[PDB]
Amino acid sequence: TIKCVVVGDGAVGKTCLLISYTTNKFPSEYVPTVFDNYAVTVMIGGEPYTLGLFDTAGQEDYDRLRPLSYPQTDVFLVCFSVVSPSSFENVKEKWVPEITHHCPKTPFLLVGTQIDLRDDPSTIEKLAKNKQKPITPETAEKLARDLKAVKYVECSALTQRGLKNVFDEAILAALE
């Protein structure tokens, strides 16, 4: 069993990508739930691997409760919304330094989420009003190198684009 922990700012899409991956469908707004500790078994090259999925949502603003989830973690998922730049800044300013402190031997991926809103005209308008632009993959891949992340991945819990790939690359990182 490989323990994977998803961390990142609030409302970046941590819970959704976990639900959308495990339930193979994006959470309906009318039927919303939390994400209990879940275990999935995927097949990579004929070899079954078991992921231990953990959701740190609701802990972001609690510094003594957050690291309780960190013990025995095999791989981290540092998340940021490609639309929210402030969540992208807290990656190098908060989350990556925090997991390096608690779990220095634990590998982590750089996960860009909500990539389906990057082309959305309505969303760019709101970002333009604050003189901000959505994080391009080229930008995020630069942060992936500078923070010594294993690699960079993008996903949409809504479109399921590159969603499977995120957890697949997560496993490969925990087998290093």
Partner: protein, 460 residues
């Protein structure tokens, strides 16, 4: 159903369902982990108490909550089975809720109107009205509701498909013992024409007598209340045991991890316990997170219930106060972890550090001059340059204490007069070698931060 109100019913559903699963998960751990380990005798009574600690106290704490949330949903279940004996067209509405929504619809009403109970509940009965419906008669119904008095009129109502039918409709309030109106009863008697004379007089008596039975068959029963914040606001102040659990759960996880590595029999024994299909393939250690995970997810749930609850809703006053109490609980628990760790560190120092050549009796776990309670920050091996003396320093929020492998080295260096590897105190200059560059970073960053905190607070 508005998208907003539909989300509310979904989040209230989430609260109760996840509570069901959570209380059940608490009881699973006790059954298949705690009790087997107590009998396994691989751990002493103290060692078992170091792991699960007040798990039992958490269960009783949430069962009291779970039963309260269940009773509210049970009210609509007990009522439906009671008013099922009445095979007449009738609905029940709640004036105390926005736009006076249907909180109950009879089976007969659903057959007549061709509607389903899911497409009706939470909406005003005005959807039955249409083109040929006399708007003047409709206003006669509105007045009776505003005037809180009964009424009996005849008007054209329409079905889901649009099939026209006359409605010998009777309305009457449902007053409590105090005398105030709490609900409305609406009886429908479908027809094909506007009944007159003997046909009308008979029909009026029928529907009025019908409403009298509904008022009696549903009396003395605490009616279904469409709100959940009233419970949470009064139940959350009793979630005190969570503060105790999370503060000591860290020592428990480290106890298991230790026992796991230094005993192969223990590791296999615990793994076999987790092979229970009820565990969904999750290890014991992950179940320890659940109490902490539950309190942190209470504000998330309540916040979403609140943001989909209108201002004029009687639940908004409770949900708002409940979210305040919920977020307080997390903070108290969050700080509870910090306080327990601090006490564990300081009490360890109190009975391990000898204080000689000092004027006053140094008590570590006490109050500082301007920062309040003393807090331990950092501690590591420190070698003094040009001397190479094996020293060991304990950094606090108010002062730095240098010891030796514990016998005190020098006078406790306060941080209101310290400077920043090279550490400077007044005139005296200290030169200390760190074990590594990362440790030299840890010292400098924390000493400077603690020094600046003392100074700025002292400058008030």
């Amino acid at each position: 159903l508005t998208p907003t109100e539909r989300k509310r019913q979904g989040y209230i559903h989430e609260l109760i369902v996840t509570e069901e699963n959570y209380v059940n998960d608490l009881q699973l751990v006790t059954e298949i982990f705690q009790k087997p380990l107590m009998e396994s005798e691989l751990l002493t009574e103290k060692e078992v108490a170091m792991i699960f600690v007040n798990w039992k106290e958490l269960i009783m704490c949430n069962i009291k909550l779970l039963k309260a949330l269940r009773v509210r949903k049970k009210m609509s279940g007990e009522l439906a089975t009671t008013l099922e004996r009445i095979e007449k067209n009738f609905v029940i509405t709640d004036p105390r809720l926005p736009d006076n929504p249907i909180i109950f619809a009879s089976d007969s009403f659903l057959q007549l109107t061709e509607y389903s109970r899911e497409e009706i509940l939470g909406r005003n009965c005005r959807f039955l009205q249409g083109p040929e419906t006399d708007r003047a008669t409709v206003r006669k119904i509105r007045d009776a509701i505003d005037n809180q008095t009964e009424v009996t009129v005849q008007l054209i109502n329409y079905t889901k498909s649009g099939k026209k039918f006359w409605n010998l409709f009777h309305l009457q309030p449902m007053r409590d013992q105090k005398g105030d109106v709490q609900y409305f009863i609406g009886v429908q008697l479908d027809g094909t024409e506007h009944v007159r004379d003997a046909a009308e007089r008979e029909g009026v008596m029928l529907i009025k007598k019908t409403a009298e039975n509904i008022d009696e068959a549903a009396k003395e029963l605490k009616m279904p209340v469409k709100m959940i914040g009233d419970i949470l606001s009064a139940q959350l102040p009793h979630m005190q045991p969570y503060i105790r659990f999370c503060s000591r759960q860290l020592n428990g996880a480290a106890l298991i991890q230790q026992k796991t590595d230094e005993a192969p029999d223990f590791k296999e024994f615990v793994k076999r316990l987790a092979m229970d299909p009820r565990c969904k393939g999750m290890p014991l250690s992950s179940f320890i997170l659940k109490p902490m995970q539950r309190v942190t997810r209470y504000p998330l749930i309540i916040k979403n219930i609140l943001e989909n609850t209108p201002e004029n809703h009687p639940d908004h006053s409770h949900l708002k106060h409940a979210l305040e109490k919920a977020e307080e609980l997390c903070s108290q628990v969050n700080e509870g972890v910090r306080e327990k760790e601090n006490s564990d560190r300081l009490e360890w120092i109190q009975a391990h550090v000898q204080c000689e050549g000092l004027s006053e009796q140094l008590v570590f776990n006490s109050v500082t001059n301007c920062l309040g309670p003393r807090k331990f920050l950092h501690s590591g091996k420190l070698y003094k340059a040009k001397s190479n003396k094996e020293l060991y320093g304990f950094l606090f929020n108010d002062f730095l204490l240098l010891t030796q492998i514990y016998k005190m080295y020098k006078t406790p260096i306060f941080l209101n007069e310290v400077l920043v590897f090279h550490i400077s105190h007044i005139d005296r200059v200290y030169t200390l070698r760190a074990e590594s560059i990362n440790e030299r970073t840890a010292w400098v960053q924390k000493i400077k931060a603690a020094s600046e905190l003392y100074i700025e607070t002292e400058k008030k």
